[PDB]
Amino acid sequence: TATYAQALQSVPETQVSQLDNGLRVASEQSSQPTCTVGVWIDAGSRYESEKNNGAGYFVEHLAFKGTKNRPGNALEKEVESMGAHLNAYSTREHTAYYIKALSKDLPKAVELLADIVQNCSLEDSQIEKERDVILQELQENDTSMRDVVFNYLHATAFQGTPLAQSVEGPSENVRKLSRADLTEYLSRHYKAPRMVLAAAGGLEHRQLLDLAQKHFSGLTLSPCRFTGSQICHREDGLPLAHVAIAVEGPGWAHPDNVALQVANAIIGHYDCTYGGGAHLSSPLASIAATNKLCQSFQTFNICYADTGLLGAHFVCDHMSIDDMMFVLQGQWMRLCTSATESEVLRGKNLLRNALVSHLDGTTPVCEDIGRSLLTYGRRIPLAEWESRIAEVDARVVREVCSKYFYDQCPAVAGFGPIEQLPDYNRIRSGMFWLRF
Amino acid sequence: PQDLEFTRLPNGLVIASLENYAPASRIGLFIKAGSRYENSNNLGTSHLLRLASSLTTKGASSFKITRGIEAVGGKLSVTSTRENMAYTVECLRDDVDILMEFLLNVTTAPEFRRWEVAALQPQLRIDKAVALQNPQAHVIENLHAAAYRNALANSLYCPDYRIGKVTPVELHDYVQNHFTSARMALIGLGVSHPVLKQVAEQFLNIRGGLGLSGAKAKYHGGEIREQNGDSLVHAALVAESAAIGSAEANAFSVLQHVLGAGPHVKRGSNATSSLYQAVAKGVHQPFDVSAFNASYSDSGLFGFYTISQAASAGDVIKAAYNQVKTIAQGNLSNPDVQAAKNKLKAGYLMSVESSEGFLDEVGSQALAAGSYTPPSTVLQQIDAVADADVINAAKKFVSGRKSMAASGNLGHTPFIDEL
């Protein structure tokens, strides 16, 4: 049946296989007519040099412009022949190439895919075309303020590290960019073991690995500095002013990463548009709906390899900024001391739900593996996560937050019309309570 | 585990159930009441009603309710369209009973407290606004007016003089007017039938009254052009399509994948769509065209929604429209259709494979049929489409009253008379 305890038990397990040249193989059988076929690569900007900045990004567009065996636009005209959707995306710490398809024609898929991974048509026809679009887009990118401030955010904490740099990289490089340097980075980091392969669907493990089928896969990092600081772009014309505030935290692999998953879930989030009103349990969603001290906000977590990011992102009236803050320091600080096991539970349940929730669907299932592999390896400790949940304690959360919050140096990002936002020296004194 | 179990009642309300093994345990509740069921003085009610969700039941204080779902970790959802409003809820495998019980109290036990009703007046706009970020959003709503007179022309949103207009009572009737155990349909997912089967008949048997079908929507075309400040003018051309649940509805559902391009590849301008290609070739710098097909119970519409720049729109329309002619003239490619069939079958299954989506697909059949059809049968029926069908299907869109909606800078914007 479906019973939460038993519900953990029966799942198609993590599968693993390993080829010779460093390629990884892995899978899970969902008993489904379709398969998400995907690839994840750990080559980052944090690898990329100061010219390489944004190049792999530029590269990202290029694969589908045609390849070695398949010149321009002969690539997709086979793809859509099957009717199988196709997509690719990249990230500072990862890049994921993947396919969503019926399990039938997969024998082509990976072979199609394998061609793309390395064999590529590097043709300055596409280059200039793509060189333009990016440049076109580079300027357009000022339209979504969200992404904008984060760029500021990293650079202010991680200054002096390749991690602190634009994903697309600065503009002039893209013009200056030449496809030989690509071929470098093409050759550099697209080797295995850097490469990793997974999939999920009706696919069985060995019927994956057999048709993982002989093609090829392949043949530097530093701990980053953390900057107590501030950045402000003051532009007063705009109606609203985003805010972001955070402190650094543990990397991907680390015990406490889960212990802090809940504190966010507990403190929760608010938005203009909820039907929750003023009776919600989250003090923030109660007040921020009550006096509409903000339009909305949400809290984030991002844990890098060695690093982690805890903080929120809010939007409030140009006269309402201060009061959002003096509230927001309330919640974190009060947790570190006076918190209680009751509210723990309501946080505990949610994260269980959110965990179980995201686990439906081919691609997301497929998608965990790749990062997880590049992160914890094969580990998909599904039922364990539950056991992991049972670990967390009142002291734990307090003792955890005591570390990473009380009397620390926070980072401050801002975007105009900021001006109200108090000076740092307030925020700093505002981190540690005086016992009030 | 166990496959689809759907059960007629004496009330006729289908209680459909499956058994899962998953700890995710969800339930959903469908209702026939859409915007078409609002009257001239009843306007926006459902849209307002759709914000009646969180309010004070007759079974409990809304406070307790709201603090209830969170501390449990469950989640509530509400959804409507021009036709079928749907009340969705989910939580862990174990605790559904507490939650499930509250699903009733809301739909079972209404209370409209004149004070509690007032605070929701401010809310509509801020909701109503954010939907109109997307220009296409505003464009669509206008369209149902142009092509109809009465029913589907009804907005999903509140015309603004209608704002202060709505009393608890007006709601209160439409509550019980359009509610009946004949129309109500309940769907389980992860929970055994008998538990589902138990409480279903218990509370949910009320009347009667039902269902006010006097809206045939009376397709009546026309065109509407709003003068606006966008650089990218938006427009669409529609000759009425057929009713839902028909090979024609499939034929157009096939006919779309002919021209209709959703990207199957990121950033890829879809070449297999002749539409964009046959356009983009004779055409110039950025634009987009996609084919729009949608059907409701009694009927639906087929069209294509264009996005172009100031001068281009007409030729953007015209060529594409002229390109439509090409198809209507006896142009055919069986493999393309075949590939399109492959697209559709996949696209269908890829659509359906999603449980939550399929969760709808369950009751989307129910209020429509009340039975279940394996997608295999669909996939079979997908095959059943003849080409001359899709041939003459497009011919219809050419062969019949067509309608336009346009908004932006209109200086160069042609009418349908230019067409």
Binding site: - | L76, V78, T81, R82, N134, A137, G262, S295, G303
Partner: peptide, 22 residues
């Protein structure tokens, strides 16, 4: 022309902001 997944549009309000559709 977007139905694009499905027939016409959508609206949803519960908590988390909202959703549109085609």
């Amino acid at each position: 022309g977007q139905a694009a997944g499905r027939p016409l549009v959508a609206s949803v309000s519960l908590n988390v902001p909202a959703s549109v559709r085609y």
